[PDB]
Amino acid sequence: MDVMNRLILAMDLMNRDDALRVTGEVREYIDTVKIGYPLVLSEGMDIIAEFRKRFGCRIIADFKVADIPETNEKICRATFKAGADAIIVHGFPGADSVRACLNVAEEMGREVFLLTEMSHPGAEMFIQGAADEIARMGVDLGVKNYVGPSVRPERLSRLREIIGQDSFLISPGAGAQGGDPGETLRFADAIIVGRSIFLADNPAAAAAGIIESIKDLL
Amino acid sequence: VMDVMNRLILAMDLMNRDDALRVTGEVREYIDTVKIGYPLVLSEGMDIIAEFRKRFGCRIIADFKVADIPETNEKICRATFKAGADAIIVHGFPGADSVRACLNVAEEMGREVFLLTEMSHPGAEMFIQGAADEIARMGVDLGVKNYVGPSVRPERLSRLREIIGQDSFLISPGAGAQGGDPGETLRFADAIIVGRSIFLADNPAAAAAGIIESIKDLL
Ligand SMILES: O=c1cc(O)n([C@@H]2O[C@H](COP(=O)(O)O)[C@@H](O)[C@H]2O)c(=O)[nH]1
Ligand SMILES: O=c1cc(O)n([C@@H]2O[C@H](COP(=O)(O)O)[C@@H](O)[C@H]2O)c(=O)[nH]1
């Protein structure tokens, strides 16, 4: 996956007008948008097709898929039917649940991203202690795309070590949650950024500023 | 606790509005509580909740297995309750802040959170099972009153019930298609969740009536 400027916009605004406007304002800087449940549950799955029509961006559906295999398969089918290029899946529910998603992705020409460790404080309670094993499970399953946390670069580095330099790694938590774009890109292929762009006084200037700060990494 | 008719919750995981409405209508004399998940919501929109309320007046549990950071969890809960869900199901494995975020929205909005502890599928044994007792204890500490645990592992369901106490409300999927037994499950759970063995039946009403007949002494 070739992500422009190593920057993925997390579009978590919950109003169609604002989401489209803000994405349009930063469109020259990105070609990849992460769309999650805040926007989808507020405006419908048809929002994905609308983003493709307006921006011709790739769409990662951040749905943190975390059900049994039967239900995971259905969620992935509905998601890819809506035009998502990729879907993010939790690893914590185990290998069969991940495989269910991989199967649908292969059938429909899409990608699965495996979420290993998360960026929030609560991730330390259960996820963190399982994360290396979840990453190894991904490797065993042939997963090529991973998500790990900007806010813990030592954990992000370990995740990179496990999956190898050939796998693709994206990372949320830079900006609002305190992560640093440049440090994160030592290990991740791309950073995910939401609020520090879409809540900024001037979203375009915010995106341009982030990119300026990592210019030597592009 | 919510008064679930016949201790039986329909898992409506059909992905077509016409079929989902037909089947739900057919079993309405037996079931007043319906679990709507992402297979239906992502296929037909959040307005499917509105449609179910309009047509059936059933309680709606939004099975969204909420599993994000606190900020995003809050947004998901707000959108879900705005659409008319009575309750939402939240994963415990992302930790206490993520659960608290959902509880705070539910409190503000006058709705309920169900905490999913252990899951029913084989993959649950890899990571979830070993965390489940602690996830349940965390729920009790946070003031969670409603829980989800697996029909297919009676021994685990019993332990979950012990942890949360007799006053907590516990619902349980895995009977029927996944092999769990309704009667045994209801030794510990307040209600069983049943999907495919009802909604794929030639006669979903007869399937529901049959399940209920088999547990009639427990009603
Ligand atoms: O560990 C994770 C995994 C995520 O997908 N995310 C997602 O990444 C985005 C982060 O947005 P922000 O830059 O506003 O903090 C949100 O959409 C969030 O749900 C995260 O923050 N941490
Ligand atoms: O551990 C769990 C938690 C669930 O919510 N579920 C949900 O309960 C339902 C089970 O349906 P069924 O009776 O067709 O097996 C599905 O909606 C599934 O997503 C489950 O099967 N196991």
From Swiss-Prot, chain B:
Subunit text: Homodimer.
Stored Pfam families: OMPdecase (PF00215)
Keywords associated with the record: Decarboxylase, Lyase, Pyrimidine biosynthesis
Active-site positions on this chain: 65 (proton donor)
Enzyme class of the recorded protein, top EC level: lyase
Organism classification: Archaea, Methanobacteriati, Methanobacteriota, Methanomada group, Methanobacteria
Top-rank taxon, per record: Archaea
Organism, as annotated: Methanothermobacter thermautotrophicus (strain ATCC 29096 / DSM 1053 / JCM 10044 / NBRC 100330 / Delta H) (Methanobacterium thermoautotrophicum)
Molecular function in Gene Ontology: orotidine-5'-phosphate decarboxylase activity
Protein EC: 4.1.1.23
GO biological processes: 'de novo' pyrimidine nucleobase biosynthetic process; 'de novo' UMP biosynthetic process
Keyword Glycoprotein: no
Name by which UniProt lists this protein: Orotidine 5'-phosphate decarboxylase
Pathway involvement of the protein, from the record: Pyrimidine metabolism; UMP biosynthesis via de novo pathway; UMP from orotate: step 2/2
NCBIfam families registered for this protein in UniProt: PRK13813.1, pyrF
A cellular component annotation (GO) from this entry: cytosol
Binding-site positions, substrate: 13, 35, 63-72, 120, 173-183, 195-196
Family: Belongs to the OMP decarboxylase family. Type 1 subfamily.
Reaction equation(s) it catalyzes: orotidine 5'-phosphate + H(+) = UMP + CO2
Role summary: Catalyzes the decarboxylation of orotidine 5'-monophosphate (OMP) to uridine 5'-monophosphate (UMP).
